[PDB]
Amino acid sequence: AKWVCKICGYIYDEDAGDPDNGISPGTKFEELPDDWVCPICGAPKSEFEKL
């Protein structure tokens, strides 16, 4: 799945993960740590929408 950061337009792509921030590819948004935030704008998970 892909999730958009409603603040900045960043797309969290579960296939890509966010490795620079400790998230390996294929990590589901729901599996992201609670304290993970948008690597661009710092928005909390609550501000993401599943596409």
Question: 13 forms bridges with which residues in the sheet?
Answer: 2
List 2, 29, 36, 43, residue binding Fe ion (CB under 5 A): 43
Select 5 or 23, whichever has its Cβ closest to Fe ion: 5
Q: Does 32 bind Fe ion (CB under 5 A)?
A: no
Enumerate residues 3-22 that contact Fe ion by CB under 5 A: 5, 7-8, 10
Contact between 7 and 47 under an 8 Å Cβ cutoff? The reply is: yes
* Interacting residues toward Fe ion by CB under 5 A: 5, 7-8, 10, 38, 40-41, 43
